């Protein structure tokens, strides 16, 4: 009978709990109190981009800190020139139920996927000058929730049918499959060295995956509800999560525990996206009460607020060099700040 | 100006992009956006027939009005995380089968799902059409199987005219938004055009009431 599982599962769970509690000497707050407060930070709308006619669901910064891409519930994918607001390319989609986009590190490829259970790959450097499709990746049985690039020939994908799978764009067949989640999977984020990636799902759990061995290694828990967005801290040895609990958290990849939490009573709605500043000193957490906040990472105090949107914020990103910030929202206006 | 002959052609391109983005953002306001729900019985297929992978979209034209129906029966994943993509639909289209009153486990499930959808925060102002299917088998089963099986508290005679019309009171009493939305019930006369003509007439009521709420006349 399956009763023989209970004892072993209990002992291993208690062993992991005891280890994680024994390695918890002191919190991040205790040693950080000595550094000076950042004070009050003000930013202003140095630019504003217009042209989508519906809600906006994702965005990704280019690699040279000047271009970016965004996709909306209309069948439109558009690349902006962020300096002079010129539109560079506008790409018509197949299925209007869009939820993801990504920019290649070489800035040559762009990817998209939606409710049709398929992820597509586009070629920005043709000899006719117009974007074309090169591959369609099929094999999931749930909505596609995230996607990232390793290089020009390896893309990672994530779906709500509990299965994350690493692919090879050249042939079209997945060359690994990651399993272990019980519910829908919502986000993933690579490592700076491009050998790992973490993910978060509706189970209220986060799992670290070895890209090459194809096997899970570590699990992080502590959120009270579903998890919406995830980001990987710029050193490469931490990441931060955002949930529908109206709370965000910082996790560590070396001592295996939650480090810090950022929560305030005046917010009852849940976080939609999370991203980091270039020194790791700021955390720009978009929210559901129609505006975006700013949190100092080390001390958890909130420096300021960017409030220029008339609806829920859905996607934000910090540039590669550190100049600016961009945010999108369901009101169809992308605003560049600085 | 302070623009070179290069950068002065990188703004004509960005204008010529919008001159084609708008011409195709207004073409998408001439179509009617209808959702569909219910159990996956045979009713759906016949309904699509008489109107002539993860999402299936059907289109049909009738009296110069184009509808598009997003049958979401192919997803089978957690509903709370993709339902809001369908905000701003014109009208829902429900589906119910009469014959399943005794199989009364099926009836309670349909009632529970009707209750669950109606009070969503994303669907406060959407008009719910409701169809009713399998009258032919219902009238033959009721002649031997009493309605007391599904509803023991039925104090009525259980005659055919007094039986089939008892369900609608229980269906349309579930609405908690009487002042904003209304059920437009029907009996599926599968042999004639009244299946789709009823939808055509039932859409204009809410179109007009929404116009009369926008201009302020209400």
């Amino acid at each position, epitope marked *: 009978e399956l009763d023989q599982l209970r004892q072993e599962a209990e002992q291993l769970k208690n062993q992991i709990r005891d280890a994680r509690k024994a390695c918890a000497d002191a919190t991040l707050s205790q040693i950080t109190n000595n550094i000076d407060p950042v004070g009050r930070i003000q930013m202003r709308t140095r630019r504003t981009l217009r042209g989508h006619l519906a809600k906006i669901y994702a965005m990704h910064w280019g690699t040279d800190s*000047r*271009l970016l891409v965004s996709a909306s519930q209309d069948g439109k994918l558009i690349i902006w*020139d962020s*300096y002079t607001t*010129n539109k*560079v*390319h506008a790409i018509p989609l197949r299925s209007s139920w869009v939820m993801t986009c990504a920019y290649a590190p070489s*800035g040559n490829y762009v990817a998209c996927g939606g409710l049709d259970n398929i992820c597509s790959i586009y070629n920005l450097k043709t*000899r*006719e*000058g*117009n974007v074309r499709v090169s591959r369609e990746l099929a094999g999931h049985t749930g909505y596609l929730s995230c996607c990232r690039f390793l290089d020009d020939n390896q893309i990672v994908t994530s779906s709500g049918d509990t299965t994350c799978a690493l692919w090879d764009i050249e042939t079209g067949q997945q060359t690994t499959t990651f399993t272990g989640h019980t519910g829908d999977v919502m986000s993933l984020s690579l490592a700076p060295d491009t050998r790992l990636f973490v993910s978060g799902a509706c189970d209220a759990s986060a799992k670290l995956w070895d890209v090459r061995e194809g096997m899970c290694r570590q699990t992080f828990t502590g959120h009270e509800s579903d998890i919406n967005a995830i980001c990987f801290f710029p050193n490469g040895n931490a990441f931060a999560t955002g949930s529908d609990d109206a709370t965000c958290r910082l996790f560590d990849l070396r001592a295996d525990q939650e480090l810090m939490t950022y929560s305030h009573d005046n917010i009852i709605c849940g976080i939609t996206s999370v991203s980091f500043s270039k020194s790791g000193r700021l955390l720009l957490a978009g929210y559901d009460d129609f505006n975006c906040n700013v949190w100092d990472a080390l001390k958890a105090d909130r420096a300021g607020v960017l409030a220029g949107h008339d609806n829920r914020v859905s996607c934000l990103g910090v540039t590669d060099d550190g100049m600016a910030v961009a945010t999108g929202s369901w009101d169809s206006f992308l605003k560049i700040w600085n | 100006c*302070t623009l*070179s*002959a*290069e*950068d*002065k*052609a*990188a703004v*004509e*391109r960005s204008k*010529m992009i919008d*001159r084609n983005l708008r011409e195709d953002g207004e073409k998408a306001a001439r179509e009617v956006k209808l959702l569909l729900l219910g159990a996956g019985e045979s009713g759906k297929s016949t309904i699509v027939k008489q109107m002539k992978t993860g999402i299936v979209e059907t289109h049909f034209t009738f009296k110069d009005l184009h509808f598009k129906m997003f049958d979401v029966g192919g997803q089978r994943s957690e509903r709370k995380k993709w339902i809001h993509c369908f905000e701003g639909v014109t009208a829902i289209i429900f589906c119910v089968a009469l014959s399943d009153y005794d199989l009364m486990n099926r009836m309670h499930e349909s009632m529970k799902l009707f209750d669950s959808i109606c009070n969503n925060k994303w669907f406060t102002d959407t008009s719910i059409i409701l169809f009713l299917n399998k009258k032919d088998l219902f009238e033959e089963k009721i002649k031997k199987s009493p309605l007391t099986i599904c509803y023991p508290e039925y104090a009525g005679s259980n005659t055919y005219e007094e039986a089939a019309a008892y369900i609608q009171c229980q269906f349309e009493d579930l609405n908690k938004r009487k002042d904003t939305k209304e059920i437009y019930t029907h009996f599926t006369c599968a042999t004639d055009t009244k299946n789709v003509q009823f939808v055509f007439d039932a859409v204009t009521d809410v179109i007009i009431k929404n116009n009369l709420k926008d201009c302020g006349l209400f």
Partner: single-chain antibody
Amino acid sequence: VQLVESGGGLVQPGGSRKLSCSASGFAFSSFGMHWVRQAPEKGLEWVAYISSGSGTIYYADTVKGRFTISRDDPKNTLFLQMTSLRSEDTAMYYCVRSIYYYGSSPFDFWGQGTTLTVSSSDIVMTQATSSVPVTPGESVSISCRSSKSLLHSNGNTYLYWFLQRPGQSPQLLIYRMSNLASGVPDRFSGSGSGTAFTLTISRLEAEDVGVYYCMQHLEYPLTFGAGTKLEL
């Protein structure tokens, strides 16, 4: 990708004619188009322009009131209509696509060109070298000079280096000073500052023999230097 054009022939001076180019695939409906020229045994010259969507149209100081340009966007056909020709217009015409958006590479495909022979305030550029002989394997350098600065507030240096191997139409090498064109062997490069610029070829090969040109594109008028020639 192809550009093909036809027409030309013998023309009585003062007459009228037309030249047209056909694009194969190539999405001719999205590219700003020029028509660049060169006289027999002279440097490259410039004629006309037509932007995307039949809008912006510029002209050279000599062609302003004699020729008209137009694109048949549906059928992907480009025209130039000629009136009142004289002896000064006998030359070759080279349809040249271009792509103006951030990060692009203008002037990156010449058509095959067409012969036309008649019957019988601008930034100046100069380059003094001509027919210099060098043995292969050794490094070489070429330089042309500008009458005014080409660097800009935006930082781009609007100088081009093209190559015309004998018998062939030009092909882009250096679309801006620090940037080269794809499909070209890596051995070429370029450097320069202020109002003086110099080209370098690292490892001279058999096919590098040909004439070169340099172009300024800082503001509208488009001026070409003389034709330097390398020799084996």
